Amino acid sequence: SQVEHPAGGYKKLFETVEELSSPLTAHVTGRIPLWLTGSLLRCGPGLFEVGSEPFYHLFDGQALLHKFDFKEGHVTYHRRFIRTDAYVRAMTEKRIVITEFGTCAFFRGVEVTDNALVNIYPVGEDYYACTETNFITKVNPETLETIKQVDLCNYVSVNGATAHPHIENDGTVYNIGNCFSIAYNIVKIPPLQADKEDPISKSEIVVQFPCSDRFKPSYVHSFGLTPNYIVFVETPVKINLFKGANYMDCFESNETMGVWLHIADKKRKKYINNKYRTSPFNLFHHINTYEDHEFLIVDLCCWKGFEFVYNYLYLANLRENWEEVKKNARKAPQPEVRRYVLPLNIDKADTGKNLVTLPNTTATAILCSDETIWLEPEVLFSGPRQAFEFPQINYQKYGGKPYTYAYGLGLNHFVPDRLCKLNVKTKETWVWQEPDSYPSEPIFVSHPDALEEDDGVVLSVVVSPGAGQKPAYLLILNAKDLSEVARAEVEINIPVTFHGLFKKS
Amino acid sequence: SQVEHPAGGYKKLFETVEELSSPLTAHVTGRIPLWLTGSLLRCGPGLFEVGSEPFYHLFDGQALLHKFDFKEGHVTYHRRFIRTDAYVRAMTEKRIVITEFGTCAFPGVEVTDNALVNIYPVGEDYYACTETNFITKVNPETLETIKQVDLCNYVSVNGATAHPHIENDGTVYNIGNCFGIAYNIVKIPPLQADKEDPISKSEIVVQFPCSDRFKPSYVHSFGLTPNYIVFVETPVKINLFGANYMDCFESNETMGVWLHIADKKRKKYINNKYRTSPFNLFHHINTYEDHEFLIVDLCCWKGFEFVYNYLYLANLRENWEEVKKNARKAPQPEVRRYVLPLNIDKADTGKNLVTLPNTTATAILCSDETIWLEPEVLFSGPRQAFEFPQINYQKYGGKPYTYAYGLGLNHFVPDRLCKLNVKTKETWVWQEPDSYPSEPIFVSHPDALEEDDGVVLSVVVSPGAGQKPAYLLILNAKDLSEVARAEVEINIPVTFHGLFKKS
Numbered sequence A: 001s002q003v004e005h006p007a008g009g010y011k012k013l014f015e016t017v018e019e020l021s022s023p024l025t026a027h028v029t030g031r032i033p034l035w036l037t038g039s040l041l042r043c044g045p046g047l048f049e050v051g052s053e054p055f056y057h058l059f060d061g062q063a064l065l066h067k068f069d070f071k072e073g074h075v076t077y078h079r080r081f082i083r084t085d086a087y088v089r090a091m092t093e094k095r096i097v098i099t100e101f102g103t104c105a106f107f108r109g110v111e112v113t114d115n116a117l118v119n120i121y122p123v124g125e126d127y128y129a130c131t132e133t134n135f136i137t138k139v140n141p142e143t144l145e146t147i148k149q150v151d152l153c154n155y156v157s158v159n160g161a162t163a164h165p166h167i168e169n170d171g172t173v174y175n176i177g178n179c180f181s182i183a184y185n186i187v188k189i190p191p192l193q194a195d196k197e198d199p200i201s202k203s204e205i206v207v208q209f210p211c212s213d214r215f216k217p218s219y220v221h222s223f224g225l226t227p228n229y230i231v232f233v234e235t236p237v238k239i240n241l242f243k244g245a246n247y248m249d250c251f252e253s254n255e256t257m258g259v260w261l262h263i264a265d266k267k268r269k270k271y272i273n274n275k276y277r278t279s280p281f282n283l284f285h286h287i288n289t290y291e292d293h294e295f296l297i298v299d300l301c302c303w304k305g306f307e308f309v310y311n312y313l314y315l316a317n318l319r320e321n322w323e324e325v326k327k328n329a330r331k332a333p334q335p336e337v338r339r340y341v342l343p344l345n346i347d348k349a350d351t352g353k354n355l356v357t358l359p360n361t362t363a364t365a366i367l368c369s370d371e372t373i374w375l376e377p378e379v380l381f382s383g384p385r386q387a388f389e390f391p392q393i394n395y396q397k398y399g400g401k402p403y404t405y406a407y408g409l410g411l412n413h414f415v416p417d418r419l420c421k422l423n424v425k426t427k428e429t430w431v432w433q434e435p436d437s438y439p440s441e442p443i444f445v446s447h448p449d450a451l452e453e454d455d456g457v458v459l460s461v462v463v464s465p466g467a468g469q470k471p472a473y474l475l476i477l478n479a480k481d482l483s484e485v486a487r488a489e490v491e492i493n494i495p496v497t498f499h500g501l502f503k504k505s
Numbered sequence B: 001s002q003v004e005h006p007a008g009g010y011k012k013l014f015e016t017v018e019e020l021s022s023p024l025t026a027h028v029t030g031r032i033p034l035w036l037t038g039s040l041l042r043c044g045p046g047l048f049e050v051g052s053e054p055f056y057h058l059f060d061g062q063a064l065l066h067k068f069d070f071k072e073g074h075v076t077y078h079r080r081f082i083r084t085d086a087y088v089r090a091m092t093e094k095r096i097v098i099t100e101f102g103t104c105a106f107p108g109v110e111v112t113d114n115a116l117v118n119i120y121p122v123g124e125d126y127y128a129c130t131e132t133n134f135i136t137k138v139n140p141e142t143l144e145t146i147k148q149v150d151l152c153n154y155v156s157v158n159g160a161t162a163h164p165h166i167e168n169d170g171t172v173y174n175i176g177n178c179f180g181i182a183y184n185i186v187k188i189p190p191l192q193a194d195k196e197d198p199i200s201k202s203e204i205v206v207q208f209p210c211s212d213r214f215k216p217s218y219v220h221s222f223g224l225t226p227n228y229i230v231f232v233e234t235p236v237k238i239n240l241f242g243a244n245y246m247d248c249f250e251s252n253e254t255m256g257v258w259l260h261i262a263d264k265k266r267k268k269y270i271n272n273k274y275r276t277s278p279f280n281l282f283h284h285i286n287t288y289e290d291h292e293f294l295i296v297d298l299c300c301w302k303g304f305e306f307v308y309n310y311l312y313l314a315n316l317r318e319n320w321e322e323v324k325k326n327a328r329k330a331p332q333p334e335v336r337r338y339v340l341p342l343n344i345d346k347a348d349t350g351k352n353l354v355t356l357p358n359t360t361a362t363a364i365l366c367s368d369e370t371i372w373l374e375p376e377v378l379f380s381g382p383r384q385a386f387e388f389p390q391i392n393y394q395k396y397g398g399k400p401y402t403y404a405y406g407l408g409l410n411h412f413v414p415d416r417l418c419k420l421n422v423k424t425k426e427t428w429v430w431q432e433p434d435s436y437p438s439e440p441i442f443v444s445h446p447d448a449l450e451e452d453d454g455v456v457l458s459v460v461v462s463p464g465a466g467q468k469p470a471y472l473l474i475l476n477a478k479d480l481s482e483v484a485r486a487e488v489e490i491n492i493p494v495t496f497h498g499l500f501k502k503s
Ligand SMILES: NCC[C@@H](O)c1cccc(OCC2CCC(F)(F)CC2)c1
Pocket: A059, A100, A101, A113, A118, A131, A132, A133, A134, A159, A160, A161, A163, A178, A239, A247
């Protein structure tokens, strides 16, 4: 049955907070596992207005870096605003100086935002907060101090890069970005070598994907990586470069193209000219990708339709009362977890037939006479305006490999209100939910000696603004069944966070 | 997870049998419900060769009419071959005389009247049918053949489906290919006071347009609500330009699926251009109206390749490892809910029109005014079809509903019975090793309060070394728990469709 939020506590996700001067001690209930040693680092908006000047969109608020430290069953919480050009110049001029995703600021040229509110990832011995532009911000993972701004355009030919780089076990970083005919470039950052030189200075383009439209690249949020293949999903959400204006103003939907799926040989650094085609959807998050007998298994968090989902994420709409939030989502794209199966071996003799001969899937791939391969998905999870989103897996051991388990944030008409575990083989689900509690993306941490895939915990940051309650807490669930293991309660609000990582120490 | 059939018992589904001179008494295990009074009538192929001349396709064998009679907890079984032109002329000339679906006869166009697919009521009469212009009046008590009827003598259609909709007053609706190419809805009225044959009062009430001027789509079934008719135009096309029927089918690679609605009461086609990805469709499950949306529940096969290509007898008779290998590149079966908006507002161009709270089905209004549909998937198993769907038809046909019953096909071999809650997607299964059931037919308890207060009846082939070769299975519709069997000592070949006639 439909869970309701009439009290409107979710509004606290989108309320400005102050940074701390030093870490707070969190009040622990239950038992923090003694093997859990390290830092949960997470990025989100923390400042939603500069004086009387408002930010309009969910992706506009000034980057706030959060840290929960775990040591011997005790927890501290710390947060600092990232000292980006956007933040520093805003504090200096006491106004909005840099144009954000959905907020225009009112020549050196186009001043692109470095507001790194989306994610943080490792490069060599360093950590970088990012958005989706050419600017990433080196940060100190212990003090949360801002170290420097890095312009990727100083190193490689891309106009931007996603907040979802793939990290191989040796520390190699892969990312994708729009580039110049328009194309999409895969960037490779090598591991830190003996010479100890900055790995970003050894950045290179390893392969290029073509674009469906000569002058209009698709919005790309994430991509798939296996040992042998790179998967790129080209969606009908297009950037109109032929466009006072913010970033949102430049987006349009291509009604006729549907979705084009692209594979590249990772090791031979070659685009493969297989024309994979399917019906229109928005895609933000790949769940996982893997190889199975010369098929690519592509697990996706989809939104059914070509209308840009970001149209529904203005702060004015997310701050409305619950009945209005539900009404606003009535005509939105429907979320759905889909498994696509891409055949690598295309035989002309099988023209007109289903090429997906795997025994354990209902996904199909029809070879047409024009050599397009029409894909139908296997649906893994589908709930009415109930999204399985911000997906996480046991990434270190099962990223790019055959796997069973995904963890997700459950969005109820775009409001995060539960944590989900999905068995992608059986479609069995587990749920954690508490009334008037709004969790964040769940991050999986393995028991260090685990042989099983789901032997560990998930960490989520939860906002719980009740009359007589602690306003926020770090939630620790058993990854086996999402049963509660512990909470670390703080006496201050925590706004929405998007992505992060657990840094073991 | 995968159920295996190495013993190859399913071959008995496709083995010739002899008709009976009179009904056999069946051996009852468990308890036949005492409220169950009437006849289970079912049609299928019974003769798969005429001497040394073989039939090649599943839909070629000569029509056999089956009857299980229920009275006071006792059961009889009777079967008679239908005396069609195809059967009579075959017995006369001791060879294949009439061309069947997938078997050419060697010496104008003599169209098959081999009524092996279904039986349905018209007025006080019962008709066995295939999908041609010829239906066969049969005696539901004796299983005697009464008359051949040519629908072309009454209405402008080239054929009609084996899946007419029957309203509670006895009104029959059907669809068929016709000229100016189009698809015609035929209406046969109830028997009136004047007592004249209702078929002589047959009329075309509405016409659906065709996607291709010269190539009609194959149509197996259609949807009916109190106010609407739903027709699904698939990419399986009949190319009118020693051939059999199978030879004339081709797949249109680019059109996908076109969905069509007509106003039933105003007898008008509605020019809403519903479009989706390619699939084969044989069986509509149910259709209903929900706040100016049509809910369209379908048994789909993902792809444009004709599923009938996989149903030649030579392939269905192969050993189990070969049956599985043959199905590897076949379309994948999937139960899908489509939601068709009736109210299209131009102001919502580019958006999802499906505002219903209880579905993930979408309908995107495009600038060219096409409405692109995405389904809600209700059931999906690898080469495991929920097929031959049945509901509590009398009370829930065309209406909001919760429960469907189905035959489970394992790489096209029927090997289980299924119940689906279309709201929660919960399933129930009945399955026994070396047991191959038929379409389940629902019969309501006379004092039923709920939708699933009753039983389903299925005919099961079980040719194990030391077992009765076939039986009538009765399951409780609540949980598909076994209630009774009526065992016979003779084989029963595959049956497609039928009905329970209450007495
Ligand atoms: N988190 C979703 C969007 C957010 O990260 C964001 C914020 C600001 C700008 C932005 O731009 C997206 C992209 C548009 C195309 C581009 F090439 F200019 C590179 C940047 C994206």
